[PDB]
Amino acid sequence: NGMLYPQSNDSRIVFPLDGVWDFRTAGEDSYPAEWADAPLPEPLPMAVPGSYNDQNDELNLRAHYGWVVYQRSFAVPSRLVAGQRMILRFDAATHAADVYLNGQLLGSHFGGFLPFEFDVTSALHAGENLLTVAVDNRIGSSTLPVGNDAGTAFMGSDNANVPAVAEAKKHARRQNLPNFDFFNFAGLNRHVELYTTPADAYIADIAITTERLDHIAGDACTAANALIAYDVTFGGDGRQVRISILDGEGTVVAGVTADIERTAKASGEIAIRDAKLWNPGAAYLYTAVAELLPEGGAESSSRIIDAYRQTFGIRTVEVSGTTFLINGKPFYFKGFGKHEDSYFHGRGTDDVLNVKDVSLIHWLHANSFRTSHYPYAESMYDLCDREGIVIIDEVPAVGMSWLQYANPLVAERHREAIRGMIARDKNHPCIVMWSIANAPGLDGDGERPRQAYDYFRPLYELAHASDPQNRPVTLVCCQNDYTTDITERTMDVVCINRYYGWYNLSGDLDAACHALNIELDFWENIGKPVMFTEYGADTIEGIHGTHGEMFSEEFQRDYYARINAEIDKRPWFIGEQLWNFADFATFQGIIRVEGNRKGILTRDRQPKMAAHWLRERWAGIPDYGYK
């Protein structure tokens, strides 16, 4: 179950396989088997990592439906593979992939936003190796994220009662129809790499938890004592593992040698005196170095069999009444939902962009975001660990309704996504909360609200069982009839998406604020902490008015000014994450002006009027103690 990010050290090496690959589009329902067994005929170039859709303007790959096939060759010195365990890792292949090496299927995966890997020790050979990866972009009623098997995309226009329209639909070209509001970018969206570990015995997983903090300082920078726990899992086959705790300067401040017991694990606790805590706006990271010792322990030899360096931060998270406590201090979220989205790359990971976006989060005086609507690339979490930005980590369970709740295949994929996200991400101190879905159907009459609850409650429990830190769990709720939804109010933090004054009461900020206050009165009675995870207004940079109407920069600024003045009056409202950080691509349609334009930044990360207004507001709101 461990998926530690590949590391290079004295016992391990990583060989990236990124670069310009060969590529062919394939069929709507299948691809040629022979393409895995020999070089692709007449290949196109395709950079990896990246979405494929915007990498070829001769083709219309945004319209592609079905399979594509990637391929490349590689060779490595025999000297480096000898005696080692060889693993091929795919950080993400969106949505489903079949991976072949030298004409043999290594295996398959479903789930477009989480990593998977194969043991290729026996499949590799000397000299050039031929790696082929078939990737399927199709979405439908059984995928996460969810597609529509017929009709229109989410937020699509129709005239379904016109006989000519009904007839033309029957014969129209097959297309993915997202039941979600972001473009279905597909392909090898994240890195590919070959890596090595020792074969006889190796470190397979590490979990670090902050179990307890004693006498936390007034400023939350330190605690008199921190109790941390480690759990190390091994693969392979009186053995021991040395655990060293390094502080921010790399000095060993704690260390223990633990017995490995059988499935093989070592676990224990370590007390850290005068512990330096991790906080939003004030990151501090330690490293847990795990070193597998040879048979005979340190008593017999100085050599190290295997090693892995796991970053971690010491901090607690606790929901208490209507507060969200980090290191016992009442936190207030400032930020937004994001997307992994950019020109050229699509959903492809881009660390230049991640580094820039983290600086923009600081420029705005924001302190947090949500990984709307899928787990992000691993590097972004490491960056937010070092930069003191809090994350709500969310699985790709977007577009769901009652059709999905009855389907065992969907429930299995949903559990896989929750387990996989938490297994990948559990050691990040920046992650303070898990989201098990975005905007599923929860309300209505008859049995529908109960059916939704019965689907989601076990997933809430799974997210708690899976996280060794036991962080809060939420479900991000779409604008709905909050009085018949019986699921959202059971979450640990209530996370609501609301578009009062945009999708309803349009343009009327007085009415919008009145409606918002009626719903806030409902949440006030429930007595849980509540935050916005979405609210906003599509905004075309450069459209201006003295009395700003919808789509103007002024309306977007006025929107936030009015709504935020209302939530400031509620002590139990513990965060404001708006929609969205930046404009992003969507399926085309009559309400999407070259995608979603609710960004406070443009797609090129330039600030609209509302961004300047929010920057000034957020400059004056502290991370702790605002409420």
Ligand X SMILES: O=C(O)[C@H]1O[C@@H](Oc2cc3ccccc3oc2=O)[C@H](O)[C@@H](O)[C@@H]1O
User: Which residues contact ligand X (rule: CB under 6 A)?
Assistant: 181, 373, 438-439, 478-479, 497, 499, 503, 534, 579, 596, 598
The neighbour count for residue 343, using CB atoms within 10 Å, is: 10
| Nearest CA among 79, 90, 74 for reference residue 123 | 74
Nearer Cβ to its own copies (14/543): 543
CB 139 within 8 Å of CB 174: no
**Is residue 337 within a helix (H) or strand (E), and if so which, with residue range?**
strand 333-337
Cα distances (angstroms) measured from residue 512 to each of 500, 560, 562, 569, 593: 5, 11, 9, 16, 23
Q: Which does residue 439 bind out of ligand X, its own copies, none, counting CB within 5 to 8 angstroms by kind?
A: ligand X
CB of 458 to ligand X, least distance (A): 23
Burial class (CB in 10 A: 0-12, 13-18, 19+), 265: middle
**Position with the least CB separation from ligand X:** 497
Nearer to its own copies among residue 205 and residue 541 (C-beta): 541
205 vs 558, beta carbon nearer its own copies: 558
Q: How many helices (H) and strands (E) does the chain have?
A: 11, 28
Strands 96-101 and 104-110, sheet pairing: antiparallel
DSSP secondary structure, 382-430, as one string: HHHHHHT-EEEEE-S-BS--HHHHT-HHHHHHHHHHHHHHHHHHTT-TT
Q: Are 505 and 511 in contact (CB under 8 A)?
A: yes
Is 373 a known ligand-binding residue? yes
Contact 177, 63 (CB under 8 A): no
Closer residue to ligand X (CB): 55 or 533: 533
| Contacting positions for its own copies (CB under 8 A) | 360, 363, 540-546, 554, 602, 606-609, 612
258 vs 268: CA distance, rounded Å: 8
- Closest distance to ligand X from the beta carbon of 479 (Å): 3
Partner that binds at residue 181, options its own copies, ligand X, none, CB closer than 5 to 8 Å by kind: ligand X
> How near is the Cβ of 601 to its own copies at its closest, in Å?
9
Tokens of 65: 């439906």
Can you read off the two tokens belonging to residue 52? 């494929």
Judged by beta carbon, residue 132 or residue 596, the one nearer ligand X is 596
Nearer to its own copies, 311 or 602 (CB): 602
Q: Which is nearer to its own copies, 410 or 610 (CB)?
A: 610
* Closest approach of ligand X to the CB of residue 496, in Å: 8
The verdict on whether omega for the bond into residue 525 sits within 30 degrees of 0, i.e. cis, is no
> Which residue lies nearer to ligand X by CB, 502 or 624?
502
**Encoding tokens for residue 474?**
């939420």
- Our CB check for its own copies shows the closer of 47 and 358 to be 358
Q: What are phi and psi of 24, to 5 degrees?
A: -135, 145
Per partner kind, with CB cut-offs from 5 to 8 A, the member of ligand X, its own copies, none near residue 609 is its own copies
CB of 533 to ligand X, least distance (A): 8
Q: Whose Cβ is closer to its own copies: residue 337's or residue 599's?
A: 599
Q: How far is the CB of 515 from ligand X (least distance, A)?
A: 12
534 appears as a binding residue in the annotation: yes
613 annotated as a binding-site residue: no
**367 close to 612: Cβ distance less than 8 angstroms:** no
Nearer to its own copies, 347 or 608 (CB): 608
Residue 619: phi and psi, rounded to 5, are -60, -30
Q: How many CA atoms lie within 13 A of 294 on its CB side?
A: 10
How far apart, in whole angstroms, are the C-alpha atoms of residue 611 and residue 577? Answer: 13
Among candidate residues 489, 406, 416, the one with its CA nearest the CA of residue 448: 406
Among 45, 53, 51, which Cα is nearest to 23's?
A: 45
Cβ neighbors of 246 (< 8 A, separation 6 or more) are 252, 253, 286, 287, 288, 289
Residue 500 pairs with which residues in a beta bridge?
A: 504
What's the CA gap between 575 and 332, in Å, rounded? 5
CB of 69 to ligand X, least distance (A): 30
CA angle centred on 163, ends 159 and 167, rounded to 5° = 100
- With beta carbons less than 8 A apart as the criterion, state whether 372 and 362 touch: no
596 is in an annotated binding site: yes
Q: Which does 598 bind (CB under 5 to 8 A by kind): its own copies, ligand X, none?
A: ligand X
What angle do the packed helices 609-619 and 553-567 form, to 10 degrees?
Answer: 30
CB of 544 to its own copies, least distance (A): 4
| CB of residue 536 to ligand X, shortest distance in Å | 7
Would you call 551 exposed, middle or buried from its count of C-beta atoms within 10 A (0-12, 13-18, 19+)? middle
Q: How far is the CB of 374 from ligand X (least distance, A)?
A: 11
* Shortest Å distance, C-beta 570 to its own copies: 29
Residue ranges of the binding site: 181, 373, 438, 503, 534, 579, 596, 598
Residue ranges of the binding site for beta-D-glucuronate: 181, 373, 438, 503, 534, 579, 596, 598
